[PDB]
């Protein structure tokens, strides 16, 4: 093992000779270390899935929630639930309700994604802020949309995106599998298939949580029983 | 040993090394000069041509403040633009309040005070420019050079930038040989000669000579550019002299 | 390369960068300790530092800087030896810049260790000079000590100039008679002009600074006069009485009482006079002595290490007792 | 030009050293010697006088603009020993302070309240790590109606005191010793002459006798404090004082 | 362990000596006035100051800091008590406000402590005569006698030998002039010494007459002639 | 051993509360279990120095309102501020909405203050956890919650915050089953009894236990009843 | 994260509180100090809060006097609000919460002081308490803070009896201090002393913060010279 | 092995008169994908090669509309291009409602220089790390400006900025007399720009989504083409 350091490392708000801000680069790779979240967008819905930590049998429920409702139209997934994730979510919630009472109309998903990025450029009020988000929603202009909002205060729209544990091979299988033609059921099976591969081959309703956005029901997180029949549908469909 | 890293600090000599380093930025700039005439001021500069793609009529090195103050600078280009904007708004402020054109000495002090303030606080850096400016007012012709420390004096002729050594030496000959003072027409010709003589240290780059003047007889005391046949006559004087 | 480097080091001494100046003084003392400050040119009057040494330092540096090695660099031994002999003709120029830096450093807020180091390098330069360069340097230093702008600050480094003068008089006793009569004249001038007329316990006042300079110079020079005090002993004793009548500022009583200590101390002390790199403009170890015999196995030789030393005379002992009982009884 | 958070060591910002010294303030004293100009101020019987050297080696300067004597108000003036940018700053401040005082308190700013005010401003610059000391000594002069002929001197530490006479600059200790030995001889607190023509004459003599160089009209500058006028001498008026020194002896 | 306040204390321990002594019927505060030049007019700067007609101060350390402190201390004695209570403070109240001013500087980053220690002496109806030392820290202590600056260790040894609960103000002045005489850097006369009392009231120094309620300053700076009269016996 | 290529700080960041969460293990054991028709909290008593006055010592278990109780492990000084904040908030809710505070709202507000003392940075988090329990108004489902210094909160069928609370949790998992919990207060009490007598830093001064029953029936068992419950079989 | 502030008080002289069956007894010792430092002042050890409550202090007077004045203000405000004087428990809790805040809030510093609050009120009778920089407080039968805490608490433990009279608590405080004294004799000028008792004969709370002569009189009762 | 002492802050000068932190901000422009601008007398054109993170990603926005008569492009940094572009939108709206004028593109240039130079002069701040090519039309004709993060702006007939721009820039310098005479025909000016950007794509190839184009001048508002609209220019 050898050492590869540099004189411009840990430089805050400082360009290196190359024009690099290494702090925001470092923050942007810590997204590899969290719990796995996956988003699939289709003409039928946006599906968000996340790996759940195993819990004591005595735990009846908890306020750890890596998939969160922002609005009826908009849902969100984290790889970590630090104070900065809470700050971004309660900013996104306050941004949604203020737009609703101003225009009598639902916020566009790009405009909400832009708003949580502006919070990270402001640092609340060249620093990174908080954690990677997947942001999913439907609006009448740009349909079903999935965005990666980043600690840098910048973002991209994706057709499918994986964050957290598993990054290189997690997005490698998604670009191999994604179609314009995916049905919603098929997208759910695909996020469960990807979750099984990243989890070193374990899959229960106790370690996979699913959700989707549709126009008709909006954002909903699936019951353990709904994800359990979907896991059985995966287990038979791969064995067939 | 750390006295030269931030702007407020005195070194053990009692000098501000960040202002010593700001005048090194001025010394890397294009050479520019001014001449005080019998009734006015002439300014001249070597405009280095960096490529064919620059729109030739809209890159102008000489800068106009109010209508009677001409201005030129050497060193940082964003810093020169900022002092010229301070200058334009400082002159427009006096013109709005007193209804009369700002005295060149009063204008000079308002800039000197502004630039000196940027030597006080370590929350800022000095300006990396020297400004040569001047004009005609109620008291006649004035020529000023203002430096990164906020230091300024009145001059008979002033030079700053890369060619300043050669230009200062020639300007001393103008002053020695014309001790009554030069006419504005001869000062234009003689300024062209000094910019061509300054460019022979830098012959590797193309340049455009740019001249302006502000004279109570030739221009009614309004600052104007030397254009067409007089510019070409002054070029032909500088070209026979540089042989 | 070494006298080009010595010249470039001495030109680069700062008054703001005490850390760089400390590192330049380390270079200067290391060059001085090994090299003789001497001109090795015989009747070779055609050779000159520039056009002999520099052309061999511009070709050699360009050759090694463009990635080639010193092993590839071939030149005549004759061009090389002319480039060496011509290196040695530049020393009087370097010493003028050095004294001019020493008088600039008097005004600087230095540290006791850097001041001590600057004195050591000035003394090691002197012990490395031949009599020709030493006779030049002595006059240059004495001239600057009288004709300077260099004691304007609150609390100057007097030692940087006064230890060098005491070191001149250790090498040559013949300098002391004029330097000791010029100092006591200037002390009388400053005392008559009012120095030490205003009391303060805590400080040397700004009007006292020249009196303190000439008294500390007197204290330092008198410590090294030895058998040369015997020429002007009575004149010094009557001056000591005048000084103990006329000045009574409590900060100056310490400085003015060190005058007898230095006088009596030099009359009874046994110590080394001669520390020269090469003795007395004497012996013959060749002109190839850029190194001071350090590795040359002939360093241990009795004709190299024959030091004159100082052994108190009987006249110097009859004067030491005359000063001691005169002043104490006084 | 705003205040902000930034770092420094005990000799880059005004902070006590391990020995209680403020190096940034002692280094601002060395900045006062930078112009290499000596100045002298002395009290007459009903005036006070300030003489400055004038250096203009550069033949390309208009010598009319090189000026270290400043008019603060009709009654009061100053000489600055230090860099011209800091001198123009201190002059603009002292002019504004005097105008604001004549507005509020209804009489012209005394020379003891202007030196104090400027010394209080310099103390705020000696305890501030975000703003530096000025590299200047300010000598204020007027013929007050409360104390008469007045000299007050202020420095980069915000110390000030009143003076019988003073000199400021690179060679000031010789001027000061020659003034000390004048007052030790005459035993007055002033120069015993009834007209500003004889005091500006005596000050130029002492400046020549101390500095060992003669002055052309252009090598000297002059200030002449009289009740309801501080003023500076033009070169033809200074010529009168210089021509009255050659004819006298 | 040392910080910026231990260095401000070293600025005080380097500064010119001053002292305070409390007697049965008053208080003395006293110091040497040291001149930068013999051309300097030593009447034109005051070492000892009136804060209110019944409170006075003397310092040791950095003179310019003390001058800005006393300007603020006077403004503090006005905006606080004269302008709302209608009357001047007890010495305890003004010492707390002076210490609040000194603590604010040691606290704020990008400011340094005041390089002065203060002796504040005064009178009050409930507390009577009092003497307090205020240090660069913004801490305050009450004293029977004290000294600050260069001479303070020898001065405090002489004050420990000579203080007793029965001294009169006139004998405390003799002890004070003996204590200043030993530490003196310059000459010792009524022009180099500065000396004040807070003692009996002085109705002449009220500068007006009629209204029976006002009694004039308890505080009094001695003239140089009064000092020289005492120095003829001292 | 995440040095890899001798890498350090490649993420450039840190987040940490866990010094407070360790104090929450050091502190006295506190354990709570639902029944079918009750919730019982039991908390360890600290041994008391020879010269203390016991007459005014707080019960450790702490009523917020007639239907709701709070208990804690962690710093006692911090716990007072949370109990006082929970008591003023419970009075503030009960006044302003004309109905008693719901157990989840009380936990959400206690979690709200532990969140704000995490987020604000100029303060440390409180060195304490909470065991919030009782019944809602007009309800007979027993409800039982935890908060932690992190401001995370959770619902539990049984729970134990302490130093030796990993073996209590194993005994609770061994004997509790959410298909068929201890139904009657008799079983429920005897199971927090069996928990507390296993691994508490016990002595002659031992344990404080409180039964909550529906409709504001809140009762600390007597120092005799905690002894009557010691029914045993041994071999 | 406050234990250095608890180290601070350990040097600061000593205070003993002892509760009888019919009163309370505060004693404290002034540190020996410079001859010229003024003693006749407001900065002492045994202060007061209201006619029913007294405190003794360890730690710096500058941190003590702010809390003492806050307590006096809050006790005056309570008496003004309810026309019955503040309970001792509410005073110490109110003073325990102010002190906790300045320890948990990083914009502030922990108060380097620890007061022994003695008092009486009818909700719990005579109440002896200690509070320290952490903001915790405890009720006691006897307690001590500051210098010689450990040695004093052993002598308290082996002699204290729950049934003892106030006069026995006078003896026990004086005899504890004369056992654990840093000076090899004890004198009235180093000793500050107070009691809280049931009236002259009727129902009122009677404080005494003893004057120097009354201290001399109880020292010559108790056989300390 | 080396340790630059004079590049830690935007307010330090090098001993040679360099602002290294502003030079490193110019090095940030060469981190973003290539953009080209060019002009004639009647029209001015931007063309930009848009990058993406992955094949599932949307393309990053390179061209922004500031008003109906001007807009810019953004190589180097994306988020630094929105701070400047938002301010340039504000200043255009302000010029319409306060003066009843379209903002002059030279005036817009000075306003960017002003905003950028302030960051170059103040502690704690960082020079912008974005290079703007601004195009517009106003009463002086068609214009192109290159803004540099130091606070400087240049009037050009054409330029290229971003990674591997020297290819397109060298083609424009060689083609200058030709593309500046493309008047009354906007499509040939777009094709000359798309051929210029093709000299910077070293082996790479334009596609509908990888290419974006914008034009302004005479009768044509500022319009952006990307997606299927660039199909006739591939």
């Amino acid at each position: 093992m050898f050492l590869t350091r540099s004189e411009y490392d840990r430089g805050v708000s400082t360009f290196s000779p190359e024009g690099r801000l290494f702090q925001v680069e470092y923050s942007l790779e810590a997204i590899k270390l969290g719990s796995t979240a996956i988003g699939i967008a289709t003409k039928e819905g946006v599906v968000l899935g996340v790996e759940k930590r195993a819990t004591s049998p005595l735990l009846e429920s908890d306020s750890i929630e890596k998939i969160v409702e922002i609005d009826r139209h908009i849902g969100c997934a984290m790889s970590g639930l630090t104070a900065d994730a809470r700050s971004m979510i309660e900013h996104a919630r306050t941004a949604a309700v203020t737009h609703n009472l101003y225009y009598d109309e639902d916020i566009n998903v790009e405009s909400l994604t832009q708003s949580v990025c502006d919070l990270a450029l402001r640092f609340g009020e060249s620093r990174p802020f908080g954690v990677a988000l997947l942001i999913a929603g439907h609006d009448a202009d740009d349909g079903y949309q999935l965005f990666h909002a980043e600690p840098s205060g910048t973002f991209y729209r994706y057709n499918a995106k994986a964050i957290g544990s598993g990054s290189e091979g997690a997005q490698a299988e998604l670009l191999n599998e994604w179609h314009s033609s995916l049905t919603l059921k098929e997208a759910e099976l695909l996020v469960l298939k990807i979750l099984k591969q990243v989890m070193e081959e374990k899959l229960d309703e106790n370690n996979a949580q699913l959700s989707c956005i549709t126009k008709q029901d909006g954002f909903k997180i699936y019951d353990n029983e709904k994800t359990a029949e979907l896991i059985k549908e995966l287990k038979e469909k791969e064995a067939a | 040993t750390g006295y030269d890293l931030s702007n407020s600090v005195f070194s053990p000599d009692g000098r501000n090394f960040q202002v010593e380093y700001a005048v090194k930025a001025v010394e890397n700039g294009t050479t520019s000069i001014g001449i005080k005439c019998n009734d006015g001021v002439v300014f001249a500069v070597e405009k280095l041509i960096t490529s064919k793609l620059l729109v030739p009529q809209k890159n102008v090195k000489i800068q106009v403040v109010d209508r009677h103050i001409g201005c030129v600078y050497s060193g940082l280009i964003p810093d020169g633009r900022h002092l010229v904007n301070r200058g334009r708004e400082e002159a427009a402020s006096f013109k709005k309040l007193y209804k009369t054109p700002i005295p060149i000495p009063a204008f000079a002090d308002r800039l000197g005070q502004y630039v000196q303030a940027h030597t006080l606080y370590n929350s800022v850096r000095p300006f990396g420019v020297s400004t040569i400016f001047g004009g005609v007012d109620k008291n006649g012709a004035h020529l000023y050079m203002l430096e990164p420390s906020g230091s300024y004096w009145g001059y008979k002729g002033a030079a700053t930038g890369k060619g300043r050594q050669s230009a200062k030496a020639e300007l001393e000959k103008l002053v020695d040989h014309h001790p009554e003072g030069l006419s504005a027409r001869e000062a234009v010709k003689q300024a062209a000669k000094i910019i061509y003589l300054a460019h022979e240290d830098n012959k590797e780059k193309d340049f455009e000579l740019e001249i302006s003047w502000c004279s109570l007889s030739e221009t009614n005391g309004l600052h104007k550019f030397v254009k067409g046949d007089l510019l070409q006559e002054a070029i032909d004087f500088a070209q026979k002299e540089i042989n | 390369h070494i006298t080009n480097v010595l010249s470039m080091l001495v030109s680069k001494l700062d008054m703001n960068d005490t850390n760089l100046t400390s590192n330049l003084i380390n270079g200067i003392v290391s060059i001085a300790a090994f090299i003789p400050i001497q001109d090795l040119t015989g009747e070779d009057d055609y050779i000159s530092f520039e056009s002999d040494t520099l052309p061999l330092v511009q070709q050699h540096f360009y050759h090694i800087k463009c990635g080639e090695s010193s092993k590839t660099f071939r030149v005549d031994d004759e061009l090389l030896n002319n480039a060496f002999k011509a290196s040695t003709t530049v020393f009087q120029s370097m010493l003028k810049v050095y004294v001019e830096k020493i008088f600039q450093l008097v005004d600087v807020d230095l540290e006791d260790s850097l001041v001590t180091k600057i004195n050591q390098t000035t003394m090691i330069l002197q012990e490395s000079m031949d009599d020709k360069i030493f006779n030049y340097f002595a006059s240059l230093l004495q001239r600057n000590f009288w004709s300077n702008d260099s004691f304007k600050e609150k609390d100057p480094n007097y030692e940087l100039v006064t230890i060098p003068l005491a070191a001149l008089v250790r090498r040559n006793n013949g300098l002391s008679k004029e330097l000791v009569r010029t100092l006591l004249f200037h002390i009388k001038e400053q005392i008559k002009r009012g120095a030490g007329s205003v009391r303060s316990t805590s400080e040397i006042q700004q009007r006292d600074v020249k009196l303190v300079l000439y008294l500390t110079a007197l204290n330092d020079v008198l410590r090294q006069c030895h058998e040369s005090l015997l020429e002007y002993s009575d004149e010094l004793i009557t001056f000591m009485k005048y000084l103990y009548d006329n000045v009574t500022n409590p900060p100056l009583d310490v400085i003015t009482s060190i005058v007898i200590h230095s006088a009596l101390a030099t009359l009874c002390t046994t110590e080394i006079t001669d520390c020269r790199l090469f003795p007395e403009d004497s012996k013959i170890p060749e002109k190839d002595r850029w190194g001071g015999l350090q590795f040359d196995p002939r360093r241990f030789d009795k004709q190299h290490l024959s030091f004159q030393w100082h052994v108190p005379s009987s006249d110097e002992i009859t004067l030491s007792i005359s000063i001691l009982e005169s002043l104490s009884e006084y | 030009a705003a205040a902000a958070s930034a770092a420094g060591y005990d000799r880059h910002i005004t902070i006590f050293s391990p020995e209680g010294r403020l190096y940034q303030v002692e280094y601002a004293f060395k900045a006062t010697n930078q112009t290499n100009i000596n100045s002298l101020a002395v009290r007459g019987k009903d005036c006070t006088v300030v003489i400055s050297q004038k250096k203009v080696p550069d033949k390309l300067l208009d010598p009319t603009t090189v000026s270290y004597i400043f008019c603060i108000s009709r009654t009061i003036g100053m000489v600055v020993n230090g860099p011209i940018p800091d001198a123009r700053n201190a002059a603009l401040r002292a002019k504004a302070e005097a105008a604001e005082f004549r507005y509020k308190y209804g009489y012209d700013m005394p020379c003891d309240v202007l030196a104090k005010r400027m010394a209080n401003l310099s103390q705020i610059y000696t305890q501030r790590a975000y703003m530096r000391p000025l590299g200047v000594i300010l000598t204020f002069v007027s013929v007050d109606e409360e104390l008469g002929p007045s000299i007050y001197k202020t420095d980069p530490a915000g110390y000030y005191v009143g003076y019988k006479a003073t000199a400021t600059g690179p060679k000031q200790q010789e001027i000061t010793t020659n003034l000390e030995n004048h007052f030790k001889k005459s035993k007055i607190d002033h120069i015993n002459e009834e007209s500003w023509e004889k005091v500006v004459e005596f000050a130029i003599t002492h400046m020549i006798d101390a500095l060992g160089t003669e002055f052309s009209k252009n090598d000297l500058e002059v200030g002449v404090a009289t009740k309801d006028k501080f003023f500076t001498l033009s070169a033809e008026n200074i010529e009168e004082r210089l021509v009255a020194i050659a004819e006298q002896d | 362990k040392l910080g910026q306040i231990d260095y401000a204390l070293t600025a005080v321990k380097q500064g010119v000596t001053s002292l305070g002594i409390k007697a049965t019927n008053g208080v003395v505060i006293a110091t040497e006035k040291k001149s930068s030049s013999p051309l300097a007019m030593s009447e034109t700067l005051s070492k000892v100051s009136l804060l209110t007609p019944d409170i006075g101060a003397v310092y040791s350390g950095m003179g310019p800091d003390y001058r800005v402190l006393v300007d603020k201390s006077r403004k503090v004695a006005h905006t606080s008590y004269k302008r709302i209570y209608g009357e001047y403070p007890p010495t305890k109240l003004l010492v707390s406000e002076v210490a609040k001013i000194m603590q604010e500087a040691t606290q704020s980053g990008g400011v340094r402590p005041f390089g002065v220690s203060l002796l504040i002496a005064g009178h009050d109806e409930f507390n009577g005569f009092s003497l307090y030392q205020v240090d660069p820290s913004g801490s305050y202590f009450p004293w029977k006698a004290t000294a600050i600056g260069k001479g303070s260790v020898a001065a405090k040894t002489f004050l420990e030998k000579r203080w007793n609960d029965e001294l009169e103000l006139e004998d405390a002045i003799h002890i004070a002039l003996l204590t200043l005489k030993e530490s003196v850097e310059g000459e010792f006369n009524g022009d180099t010494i500065e000396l004040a009392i807070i003692g009996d009231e002085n109705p002449d120094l009220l500068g007006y007459t009629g209204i029976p309620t006002d009694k004039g300053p308890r505080f009094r700076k001695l003239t140089s002639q009064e000092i020289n009269d005492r120095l003829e016996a001292l | 051993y995440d040095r890899a290529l001798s890498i350090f700080s490649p993420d450039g960041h840190i987040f940490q509360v866990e010094y407070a969460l360790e104090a929450v293990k050091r502190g006295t054991c506190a354990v709570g279990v639902k029944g079918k028709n009750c919730v019982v909290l039991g908390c360890e008593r600290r041994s008391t120095l020879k010269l203390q006055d016991t007459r005014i010592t707080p019960s450790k278990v702490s009523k917020i309102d007639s239907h709701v109780v709070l208990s804690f492990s962690g710093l006692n000084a911090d716990s007072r501020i949370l109990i006082e904040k929970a008591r003023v908030e419970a009075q503030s809710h009960r006044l302003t909405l004309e109905d008693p505070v719901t157990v989840e709202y009380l936990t959400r507000y206690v979690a709200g203050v532990q969140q704000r003392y995490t987020q604000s940075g100029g303060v440390r988090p409180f060195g304490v956890s909470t065991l919030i329990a009782g019944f809602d108004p007009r309800d007979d489902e027993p409800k039982l919650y935890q908060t932690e210094p992190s401001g995370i909160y959770s619902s539990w069928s049984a729970q134990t915050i302490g130093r030796n609370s990993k073996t209590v949790r194993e005994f609770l998992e061994k004997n509790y089953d959410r298909k068929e919990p201890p139904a009657t207060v008799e079983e429920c009490v005897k199971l927090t009894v069996r928990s507390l007598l296993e691994v508490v830093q016990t002595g002659a001064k031992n344990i404080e236990i409180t039964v909550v029953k529906p409709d504001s029936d809140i009762v600390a068992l007597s120092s005799e009843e905690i002894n009557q419950y010691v029914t045993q079989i041994e071999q | 994260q406050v234990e250095y502030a608890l180290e601070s008080i350990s040097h600061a002289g000593t205070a003993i509180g002892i509760m009888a069956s019919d009163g309370i007894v505060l004693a404290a010792e002034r540190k020996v100090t410079s001859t010229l430092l003024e003693q006749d002042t407001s900065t002492e050890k045994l202060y007061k809060l209201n006619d029913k409550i007294a405190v003794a202090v360890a730690g710096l007077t500058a941190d003590a006097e702010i809390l003492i004045n806050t307590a006096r203000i809050h006790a005056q405000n309570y008496l003004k609000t309810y026309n019955e004087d503040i309970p001792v428990e509410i005073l110490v809790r109110r003073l325990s919460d102010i002190k906790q805040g300045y320890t948990q809030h990083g914009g502030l510093r922990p108060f380097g002081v620890s007061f022994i609050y003695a008092g009486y009120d009818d909700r719990y009778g005579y109440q002896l308490y200690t509070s320290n920089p952490s903001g915790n407080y405890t009720g006691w039968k006897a307690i001590s803070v500051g210098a010689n805490t450990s040695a004093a608490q052993t002598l308290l433990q082996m002699d204290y009896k729950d049934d003892m009279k106030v006069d026995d608590a006078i003896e026990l405080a004086l005899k504890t201090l004369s056992k654990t004294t840093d000076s090899s004799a004890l004198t009235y000028d180093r000793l500050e002393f107070a009691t809280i008792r049931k009236g002259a004969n009727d129902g009122e709370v009677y404080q005494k913060i003893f004057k120097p002569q009354e201290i001399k009189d109880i020292l010559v009762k108790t056989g300390i010279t | 092995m080396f340790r630059n002492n004079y590049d830690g802050d935007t307010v330090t000068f090098s001993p040679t008169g360099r602002l290294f932190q502003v030079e490193y901000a110019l090095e940030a422009i060469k981190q973003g994908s290539v953009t080209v601008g060019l002009r004639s007398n009647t029209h001015a054109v931007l063309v930009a090669l848009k990058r993406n993170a992955d094949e599932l990603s949307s393309y990053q926005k390179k061209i922004i509309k500031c008003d109906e008569h001007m807009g810019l492009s953004l190589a180097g940094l994306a988020p630094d291009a929105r701070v400047l572009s938002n301010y340039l939108r504000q200043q255009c709206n302000y010029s319409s409602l306060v003066f009843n004028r379209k903002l002059a593109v030279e005036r817009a240039g000075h306003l960017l220089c002003d905003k950028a130079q302030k960051n170059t002069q103040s502690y704690g701040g960082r020079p912008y790390g974005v290079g703007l090519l601004i195009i517009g039309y106003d009463k002086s004709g068609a214009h192109l400006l290159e803004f540099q993060p130091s606070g400087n702006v240049t009037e050009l007939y054409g330029t290229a900025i971003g990674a591997r721009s020297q290819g397109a820039k060298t083609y424009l310098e060689r083609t200058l007399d030709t593309f500046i005479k493309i008047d009354g025909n906007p499509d040939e000016l777009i094709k000359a720009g798309v051929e210029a950007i093709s000299q910077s794509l070293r082996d790479e190839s334009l596609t509908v989504d990888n290419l974006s184009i914008a034009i302004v001048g005479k009768d044509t508002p500022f319009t952006i083409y990307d997606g299927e609209a660039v199909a006739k220019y591939i």
Side-chain angles (χ1 to χ4, degrees), chain G residues 18-111:
Chain G
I18 307 189
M19 175 175 154
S21 59
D22 190 58
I24 307 180
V25 175
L26 286 176
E29 197 182 80
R30 298 178 184 143
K31 298 198 73 171
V32 182
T33 37
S34 316
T35 321
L36 298 174
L37 188 74
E38 181 59 284
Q39 304 293 334
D40 293 346
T41 65
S42 57
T43 40
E44 259 91 300
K45 278 207 171 295
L46 267 64
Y47 299 91
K48 190 185 303 205
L49 310 174
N50 71 5
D51 290 337
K52 311 187 182 190
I53 299 174
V55 290
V57 183
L60 300 180
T61 53
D63 292 7
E65 281 193 315
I66 170 169
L67 265 295
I68 288 160
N69 279 281
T70 302
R72 286 169 176 176
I73 289 163
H74 203 97
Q76 285 287 353
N77 188 55
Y78 193 93
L79 177 61
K80 180 174 58 69
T81 304
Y82 301 108
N83 197 42
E84 180 168 42
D85 211 342
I86 199 171
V88 194
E89 209 284 314
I90 301 185
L91 189 146
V92 310
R93 198 202 309 174
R94 179 60 178 163
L95 297 168
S96 294
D97 285 359
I98 291 292
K99 188 145 57 189
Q100 192 277 352
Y102 279 62
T103 291
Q104 70 174 7
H105 181 193
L108 301 172
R109 67 174 182 80
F111 293 107

Side-chain angles (χ1 to χ4, degrees), chain B residues 45 47 54-64 71-73 77 81 84 88 208 210-212 223 225 227, chain H residues 106 110 153-155:
Chain B
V45 58
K47 186 169 65 187
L54 278 76
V55 183
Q57 70 198 127
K58 293 179 179 179
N59 270 71
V60 182
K61 273 273 180 168
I62 299 182
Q63 293 288 2
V64 191
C71 185
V72 74
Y73 56 78
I77 303 301
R81 282 170 173 268
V84 171
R88 277 203 274 254
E208 174 164 287
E210 187 170 287
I211 298 184
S212 69
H223 175 270
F225 284 83
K227 302 290 287 290
Chain H
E106 182 179 56
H110 286 287
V153 80
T154 308
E155 271 277 341

Side-chain angles (χ1 to χ4, degrees), chain C residues 9-25:
Chain C
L9 290 175
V10 169
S11 292
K12 214 170 180 75
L13 293 167
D14 203 1
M15 274 49 66
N16 302 340
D17 195 335
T18 196
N19 177 247
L20 176 61
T21 284
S22 186
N23 282 108
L24 293 167
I25 292 286

